[PDB]
């Protein structure tokens, strides 16, 4: 679950990934 603020918003994994990266 990573992601990359570097400017890539990726939708599928961002909304998964948000909820674990973000908590």
Do not use: C, F, Y
Not at 1 to 23: F, Y
């Amino acid at each position: 679950v990573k992601i990359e603020p570097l400017g890539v918003a990726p939708t599928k994994a961002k909304r998964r990934v948000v909820q674990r990266e973000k908590r």
